[PDB]
Amino acid sequence: GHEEFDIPFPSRVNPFHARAEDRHVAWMRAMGLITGDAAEATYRRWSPAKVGARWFYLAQGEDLDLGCDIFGWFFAYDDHFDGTAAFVNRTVAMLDPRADPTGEHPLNIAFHDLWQRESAPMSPLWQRRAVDHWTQYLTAHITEATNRTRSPTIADYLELRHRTGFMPPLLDLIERVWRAEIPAPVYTTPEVQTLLHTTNQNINIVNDVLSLEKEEAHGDPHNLVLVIQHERQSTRQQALATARRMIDEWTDTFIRTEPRLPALCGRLGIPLADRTSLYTAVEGMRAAIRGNYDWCAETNRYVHRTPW
Amino acid sequence: GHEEFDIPFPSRVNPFHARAEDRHVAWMRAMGLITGDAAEATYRRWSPAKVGARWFYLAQGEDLDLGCDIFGWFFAYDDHFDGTAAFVNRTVAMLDPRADPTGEHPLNIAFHDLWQRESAPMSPLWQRRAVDHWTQYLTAHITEATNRTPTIADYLELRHRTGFMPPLLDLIERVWRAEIPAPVYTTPEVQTLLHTTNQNINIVNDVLSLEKEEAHGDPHNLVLVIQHERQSTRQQALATARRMIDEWTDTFIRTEPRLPALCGRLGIPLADRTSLYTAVEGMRAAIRGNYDWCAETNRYVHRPTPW
Ligand SMILES: CC(C)=CCC/C(C)=C(\F)COP(=O)(O)OP(=O)(O)O
Ligand SMILES: CC(C)=CCC/C(C)=C(\F)COP(=O)(O)OP(=O)(O)O
Ligand SMILES: CC[N+](C)(C)CCCS(=O)(=O)[O-]
Ligand SMILES: CC[N+](C)(C)CCCS(=O)(=O)[O-]
Ligand SMILES: CCC(CO)(CO)CO
Ligand SMILES: CCC(CO)(CO)CO
Ligand SMILES: [Mg+2]
Ligand SMILES: [Mg+2]
Numbered sequence: 001g002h003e004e005f006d007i008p009f010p011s012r013v014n015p016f017h018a019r020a021e022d023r024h025v026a027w028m029r030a031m032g033l034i035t036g037d038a039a040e041a042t043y044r045r046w047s048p049a050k051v052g053a054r055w056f057y058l059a060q061g062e063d064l065d066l067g068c069d070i071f072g073w074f075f076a077y078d079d080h081f082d083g084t085a086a087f088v089n090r091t092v093a094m095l096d097p098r099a100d101p102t103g104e105h106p107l108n109i110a111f112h113d114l115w116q117r118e119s120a121p122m123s124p125l126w127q128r129r130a131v132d133h134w135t136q137y138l139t140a141h142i143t144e145a146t147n148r149t150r151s152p153t154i155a156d157y158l159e160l161r162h163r164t165g166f167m168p169p170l171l172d173l174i175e176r177v178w179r180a181e182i183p184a185p186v187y188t189t190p191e192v193q194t195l196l197h198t199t200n201q202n203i204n205i206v207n208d209v210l211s212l213e214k215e216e217a218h219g220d221p222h223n224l225v226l227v228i229q230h231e232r233q234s235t236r237q238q239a240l241a242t243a244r245r246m247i248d249e250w251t252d253t254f255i256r257t258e259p260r261l262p263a264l265c266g267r268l269g270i271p272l273a274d275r276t277s278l279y280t281a282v283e284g285m286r287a288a289i290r291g292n293y294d295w296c297a298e299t300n301r302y303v304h305r306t307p308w
Numbered sequence: 309g310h311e312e313f314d315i316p317f318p319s320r321v322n323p324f325h326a327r328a329e330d331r332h333v334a335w336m337r338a339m340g341l342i343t344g345d346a347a348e349a350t351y352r353r354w355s356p357a358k359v360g361a362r363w364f365y366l367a368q369g370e371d372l373d374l375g376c377d378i379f380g381w382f383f384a385y386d387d388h389f390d391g392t393a394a395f396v397n398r399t400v401a402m403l404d405p406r407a408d409p410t411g412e413h414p415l416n417i418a419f420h421d422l423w424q425r426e427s428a429p430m431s432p433l434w435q436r437r438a439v440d441h442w443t444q445y446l447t448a449h450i451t452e453a454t455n456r457t458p459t460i461a462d463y464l465e466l467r468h469r470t471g472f473m474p475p476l477l478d479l480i481e482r483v484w485r486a487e488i489p490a491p492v493y494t495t496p497e498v499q500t501l502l503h504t505t506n507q508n509i510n511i512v513n514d515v516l517s518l519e520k521e522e523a524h525g526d527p528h529n530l531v532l533v534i535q536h537e538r539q540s541t542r543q544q545a546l547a548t549a550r551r552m553i554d555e556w557t558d559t560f561i562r563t564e565p566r567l568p569a570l571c572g573r574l575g576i577p578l579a580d581r582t583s584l585y586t587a588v589e590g591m592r593a594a595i596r597g598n599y600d601w602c603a604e605t606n607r608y609v610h611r612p613t614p615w
């Protein structure tokens with residue numbers, strides 16, 4: 001019923017996914033992002049906590065709750081801008097260690113809650129890059145908003161998705177939910193940067209393919225398939241085939257790069273215990289690539305082939 | 309306080325490990341393999357269901373119980389021969405669908421139960437190779453008994469052609485409910501993954517169970533075999549085992565990336581490929597779970613009995 005991709009990791013879901021949905025819905029209601037039974041029932045039809053349950057298939061308790069809550073908040077925040085600077089600047093302001101969320105919009109109170117939970121156990125090294133990545137994702141909403149008012153090239157679109165999209169924050173989140181911070185000496189290596197970049201783009205473009213009908217029905221031009229078609233004057237099948245080749249190349253690059261990590265850690269003198277943190281984050285990336293694919297394929301959010 | 313190896317997969321334990329131990333101990337008692345509270349308390353100190361819980365970190369219910377029970381039965385069966393043809397031939401006889409376990413030794417009644425549960429949902433093709441692998445593991449106990457009553461090369465051959473890993477590799481497919489597609493099972497790539505999983509786990513266990521086996525006088529350990537053959541020191545032989553472990557790990561992770569393109573060349577449908585990828589994940593979990601469990605278990609006290 002949907003485009004199928006060869007993602008070479010098993011399908012996995014956290015065993016506590018069902019209870020996780022109940023807890024996540026209760027959070028969305030407590031934060032004022034879901035109001036009323038009708039909206040809750042519509043929201044649950046998306047399996048909205050199941051994307052976190054697939055990414056974070058062994059997390060428990062508050063770690064699992066955080067992972068699930070991030071995605072639900074994203075749907076509410078993302079869909080808010082399908083409908084600015086003052087608003088987004090308030091979201092960014094919630095990253096400040098001394099931020100006071102009192103009186104802010106519910107989306108920004110919820111973000112403050114997420115960030116406090118996400119950042120508290122992580123190092124200053126992680127927090128610096130996590131603040132940068134959050135800021136880039138949040139402030140980007142102004143670039144999508146201008147495209148809509150005043151279509152990008154293939155190259156520009158790809159740059160905007162991977163430099164300023166939601167994957168840079170989600171990659172940082174993997175380290176938090178798995179409680180596995182990537183050692184700073186290996187984080188900046190070409191190998192780990194390639195793994196981060198390929199995870200980012202694979203997930204972006206798998207989502208573009210599998211959410212295409214929804215975005216077309218809404219008139220959202222921000223989709224690689226539509227961008228390719230406009231730039232190249234190509235058919236729908238041609239552009240889908242181009243996206244497919246790109247997805248396959250990123251998957252291949254990921255799985256060809258991972259085997260280099262143990263020897264790289266040896267050259268950098270990384271203690272074995274710290275290597276296991278890296279290997280755990282890389283497993284989190286595998287689970288993210290596969291979980292994104294399985295969730296985008298199954299979710300009613302993408303019916304086109306509102307709870308707010 | 310143990311030899312450490314760089315196994316490039318995360319440490320994972322099934323969330324239901326605690327309850328799985330209770331269910332597994334109850335099975336061992338129901339089968340007559342653990343008798344009395346003292347024996348149970350000694351057995352639990354080994355974390356005996358935790359090896360299944362690490363290998364099968366997402367299994368639930370009866371799949372998890374089977375995974376855990378196999379390892380517990382192995383300890384009981386293995387330790388039985390630290391204490392033969394008539395006996396092992398009865399175990400082998402329990403593989404036949406027509407077998408009647410009534411009146412057999414508790415170890416063979418328990419094996420019959422394991423095999424019924426293990427084989428019931430699997431294809432006839434899987435069952436044929438699983439019967440072969442079980443038969444080779446079981447009948448080998450006669451060669452370990454003969455040696456008690458080998459070269460490095462002979463030892464490695466005996467440990468990987470007729471040891472406990474060939475049955476455990478088949479078990480991965482059962483517990484994960486992911487049979488390796490027939491056209492890819494025989495490829496050099498998949499055979500290399502199976503072989504490297506087999507040898508890595510065997511030799512990581514040899515290194516980490518060395519002190520136990522030395523204390524019992526058991527010669528069946530690569531470190532001891534190397535020392536005898538080469539007249540080398542303990543550190544030399546441990547360093548040799550270390551290099552071998554590292555080489556097998558490297559071969560495993562260098563080989564896995566070949567699988568998607570191989571499946572493409574063989575025309576394997578995508579759903580069947582995911583079965584292969586699941587079994588390979590099971591191999592990763594087995595390599596790492598073996599390491600983490602051998603490193604933590606009281607069974608290996610002798611660094612730096614319930615029957
Ligand atoms: C949320 C998921 C599944 C993954 C995280 C990274 C991606 C690809 C998105 F957020 C979805 O992108 P987009 O802005 O196109 O959102 P929708 O496709 O849900 O409309
Ligand atoms: C490690 C386990 C339990 C299973 C995986 C396969 C291996 C290496 C064994 F069964 C241990 O063999 P061995 O005959 O050396 O058994 P023990 O080391 O437990 O005495
Ligand atoms: C194994 C049973 N326990 C650990 C209580 C399950 C808890 C899962 S949770 O915290 O996500 O509800
Ligand atoms: C997620 C909660 N449930 C499904 C009851 C866990 C049962 C796991 S089991 O069967 O291994 O005890
Ligand atoms: C819809 C299938 C296809 C175009 O025909 C795109 O993935 C195949 O290349
Ligand atoms: C005991 C450590 C060592 C020997 O000194 C064996 O692994 C290091 O090569
Ligand atoms: Mg968006
Ligand atoms: Mg969107």
Ligand SMILES: [Mg+2]
Nearest residue numbers: 207208211215
């Ligand atoms: Mg989309």
Ligand SMILES: [Mg+2]
Nearest residue numbers: 386387472528
């Ligand atoms: Mg043995």
Ligand SMILES: [Mg+2]
Nearest residue numbers: 386387390526
């Ligand atoms: Mg033994």
Ligand SMILES: [Mg+2]
Nearest residue numbers: 513514517521
């Ligand atoms: Mg041993």
